[PDB]
Design a protein around this nucleic acid. Sequence first.
RNA 1: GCGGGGGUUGCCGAGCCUGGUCAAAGGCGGGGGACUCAAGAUCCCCUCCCGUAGGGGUUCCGGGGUUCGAAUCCCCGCCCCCGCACCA
Length: 948
Amino acid sequence: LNFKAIEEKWQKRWLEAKIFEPNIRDKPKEKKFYITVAFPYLSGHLHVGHARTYTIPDVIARFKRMQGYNVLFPMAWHITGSPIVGIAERIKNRDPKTIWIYRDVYKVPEEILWTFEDPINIVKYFMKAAKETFIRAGFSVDWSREFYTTSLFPPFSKFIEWQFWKLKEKGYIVKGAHRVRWDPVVGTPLGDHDLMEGEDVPILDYIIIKFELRENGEVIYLPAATLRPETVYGVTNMWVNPNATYVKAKVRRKDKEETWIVSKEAAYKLSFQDREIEVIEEFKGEKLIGKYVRNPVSGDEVIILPAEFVDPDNATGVVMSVPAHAPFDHVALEDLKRETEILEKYDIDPRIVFPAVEEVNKLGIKSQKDKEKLEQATKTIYKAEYHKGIFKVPPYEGKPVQEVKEAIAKEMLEKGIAEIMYEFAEKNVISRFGNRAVIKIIHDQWFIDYGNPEWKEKARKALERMKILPETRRAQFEAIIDWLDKKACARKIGLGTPLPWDPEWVIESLSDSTIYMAYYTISRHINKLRQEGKLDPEKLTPEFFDYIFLEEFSEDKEKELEKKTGIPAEIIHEMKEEFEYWYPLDWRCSGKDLIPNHLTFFIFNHVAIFREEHWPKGIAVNGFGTLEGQKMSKSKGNVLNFIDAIEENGADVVRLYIMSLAEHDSDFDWRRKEVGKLRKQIERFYELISQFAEYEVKGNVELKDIDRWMLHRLNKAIKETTNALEEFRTRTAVQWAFYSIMNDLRWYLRRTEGRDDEAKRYVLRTLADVWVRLMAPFTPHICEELWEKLGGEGFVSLAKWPEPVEEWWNETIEAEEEFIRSVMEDIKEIIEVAKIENAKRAYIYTAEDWKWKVAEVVSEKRDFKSSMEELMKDSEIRKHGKEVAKIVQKLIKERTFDVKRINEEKALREAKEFMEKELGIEIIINPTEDKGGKKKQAMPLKPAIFIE
RNA sequence: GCGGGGGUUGCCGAGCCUGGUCAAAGGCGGGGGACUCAAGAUCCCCUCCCGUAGGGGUUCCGGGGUUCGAAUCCCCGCCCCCGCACCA
């Protein structure tokens, strides 16, 4: 009822024994079982959710270890990032919420907290807080191989470097433009986290089509922005806003210089949009009105009409009008007021492509002049003739709308007849400080082109050779290998490894964390050398890492690298001998949320660097976890820490309670009651073993059948379990290995109550041996203990895994047992529906011919006659004839099963007394006298009974 | 919009992939009992409708397709949850 004292007792034992620190020579390679999981991001305390992500790889690491495999399951810490950093400053500024998140939620000694201004202190207190919680939950972790990330772990960064350099040899590293939420303070990116409000506002690509106003001296553009590049061929006039103001200014890019007239604010946004915008003249709004402007794409010209619906803060302000479609084109058109010039109400109305010159939708509702109620009916039309929209215009036709909206915009952008202005869908996007968010273009912005189709095949070509779990995720993965472009593999803030060819740039997290799986492979010997200054980080070069990953074994490259690095040759050989042994990585665990990224980048980077025969061999993912329904939010506070939870329930309980709940990608919900109750059950299990532990290990006994049964179910549960596990199917496993055996055994007991012979002992004592070895992975502590209470040998953790035993199998007795069970059920019902008391009942089974022989034949014609023909052609069977209607009935309930022949004997053997004891009635098997029409007025598996 | 997966009995949640043995695993909630003045706790039993002899009827979102037979396989419809990029 405690185990806290025991838990520790063993973590120390396992630890010191260095039992979970595999040795390659220990076994051949086809025995190895490398397996990893994503190193957490030391930023706080892992909660129950992350708890699960880790148990699973352990549970399997243990399991397979007992299974006889040379298992390797390490763990390290991931810190390359920016949250920690930002967090630091925040507690510095003595932030009320962030401090509450560490003072109450993650509970940190009021004192220690304050020392957080230093990021390294946050990457210190929690690195420690992890390794301890992992070890306090008893993971088969080989700490020999352990390291943290960033430029702070020199040998790793060198590895990471080698990687990225090797990423240019293939040309997967590129530079280019790149939008990104931003804070106009003094400068700072907004990674979808700093925004003090609405961070879900999408990044629209309103492209501006530079219309021409070649009046006075010369040229000047009025770039209107439309999300429908197709409407160009339907321009019928321009739109601006008299009220709001605009400006004239030069706009320079790479070299090309132009002079634009757009919204003041539109200047602002663009000033960041990677273009120097030196102002020149402000307008008043209606100024632009009057002038005409030539439609760039076509050749025609148009007038600049004034409007009220044109939002200034939205895009350039200038909107190309095409009333033939966009229902917002007729709002100001419906002229009636008094402005100035006149005559144009009779301007032709062309149209691109329910009807034609649409307007049966605008007034097809209840719209008067200018109402935002149309802000919807304006994009309702956009969809209809979007998927269903044949093209008809002076230029090329036929193709669908989703084609010109990519034949025009592709052409204009190409001929510089249009440019793209990035702008939000809404205005509610504020920064961390308080400023209003804008968008900026990054020229440099390094990339990793997960686009290059020759690589995006190399990947897809691997994934099919891998293994997925669940398997119903195979799709999602492929699908992602497709819809994936180039990812910005670097930032400017936080910790991480600096780009070996642009120290200004800091390699971001999810980009460096993709092939470390192979660093562990040598992480040991490096901590060895690193341990006592016998390692010069520098000496660890691209040239270096290459020998120990690709370059086949050349005795000299070792000698050559010996001096170059300052490391013994034989130590290098071993290092590479390690990797070559441990890779490929049989499995890689992680949550499902990392499929649409890391899990994937993981396959890519891999196929890009490792000799194919080193490609991942499979991936297993898992669901999230909640807490009493409500989702765990670091901010709301309802979050159970892993450790904080191991403390109030105990590792073994917690551990199993998790697997207990779900498998694969299914989420789980942590409930207090549930866990408490599973706890009691654990104890009952605990105790029980302890008892059976007494029983002498005598053996050689004469077990009755009820014993062969509890022994059959053991065998059953043994097998079913072996499976669920082979397939990371925890919930199931636990249902077999635990809740099953439990139940089956409680019955066996209830079954053989008041009994206790050299045999009932054997069963019980041997059950114990197995049962214990089975839960070993879920609850490794109380088992290392109970394994001791029983005869015991070596650590339980290294104990071979129990596989079904030579027969000991009895589908038959298993069958007979449910039979008697069912009989009981029947009698119980017969009485529950009528009589009262009566000391007894009478019932008879059946016999071959008269019955059974029929059924074991019907079940081989499954028809109606062919059987009846097969039968009447037999004496002592046709002998009843008119009664062989047993075939009719028997037919309308599908075929048969086996023959629980000794049947009546089971109803007899060790059942007779039990049954009567439980039913509290006198049982009389196969009588002679004929009661209520008893005698052979019965069927197989359903004997006839008569109470009274 | 691109895309991934789905809808089950009072609820939560299996089972559908290897159709028939599913009235439908498990849990929770509800109820009766051993209890024995009295909180708790363990175990047993019932919980879709009906039933004065172990039975009968209707069930797995709507409608069809396929089959001797579908919660289970195919199609159309409606509906629901999830990622989209530098953010771990």
